[PDB]
Amino acid sequence: GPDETLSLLADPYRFISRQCQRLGANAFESRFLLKKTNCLKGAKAAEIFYDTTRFEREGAMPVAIQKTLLGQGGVQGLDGETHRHRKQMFMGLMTPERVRALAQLFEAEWRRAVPGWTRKGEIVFYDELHEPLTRAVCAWAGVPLPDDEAGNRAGELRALFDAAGSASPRHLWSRLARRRVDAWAKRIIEGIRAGSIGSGSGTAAYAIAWHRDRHDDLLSPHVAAVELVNVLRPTVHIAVYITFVAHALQTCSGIRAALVQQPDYAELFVQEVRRFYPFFPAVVARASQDFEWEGMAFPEGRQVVLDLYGSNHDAATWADPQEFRPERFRAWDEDSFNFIPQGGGDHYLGHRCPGEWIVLAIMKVAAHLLVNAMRYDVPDQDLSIDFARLPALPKSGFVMRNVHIGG
């Protein structure tokens, strides 16, 4: 077959599921770069993809994503016991108390930023979320962050994902941001180890600075920096989900009211935002041994991508995936493979996102504030999602006017 790289990049989120619908199947062979690639979709495909006797991550991730979004030497590129030991370091951060502490810090930062928004008149809501998220997570993770630096660091953390998926001086800026963010996190780690930074023992930076690997060795400072940024970066990009919360409240009738009255509704709602809206298109692995599945050949070494967006919109699983309907999660069986916006499978024994609790907690705070505390006008604007952009967003970035909170 031909190389479909251009077609994918023109439709990164929907390419796979459209070809699956066209072929009446959940898998197809294709090609991106020099690489034959099996593309998969749906709960069944997700279950094999997360079987680690048949898939590994080492070497799988395109280097372009390494030197921007992910960094080099972090948990995403690990397999086996080496992975699980490193993954444990992330999971230990995520106690209900710690998750709640970050949500509280984030609410404080949101509230502290509003006067700035009021004084502005008009704001692009999306642009405005990165700094409070940055301030919150840094303080939570034991990372010192002077007031006059916060905005710059927010910009750098943002550029790791919002500039990592573009052409022009945009990809250049993303690689530089990665270099700056890496060097910065590395000085944080070194300062903790030398005793000149007094991060608390319950904080991420502390846990990462002091982590011992399966040989009782500290992480090398660069690897520690990369793992710290694996906490800071994705937290700041909860800005994407928070923007979709405001979008849903604006475009889907009944949601605002349901959210005001019905006390149990916030949970269903945040879940449905994660299910409905695009975030990460897909995840990549490599076949670790020969096997066949559903008539498809998976030879050892075959690059394999699992469509997250398509799996979340699978009609087999959700009778009407095209609808925004929080209520659907009343019937959900908490299956770990049929609902995968932040990965599937087991958190400890695979690469499933450790940040889910944080994401949920912060999304709940957003919904609360947008609905119960913060009032704003929404002018005529293009709110349609740009599906040709990574990350996909409302084209306007969600514009707000006359924003206030103290009335």
Ligand code: HEM
């Ligand atoms: C903001 C929305 C977020 C989305 C859409 C998201 C999505 C994901 C996805 C799809 C994966 C990979 C699953 C796989 O490879 O099978 C992942 C991995 C990971 N995420 Fe999340 N994430 C989000 C926020 C977070 C947050 C808040 C953290 C906080 C620490 C986080 C930390 C990680 C880490 C460390 C990994 C690698 C885990 C491993 O390889 O075992 N991300 N993210």
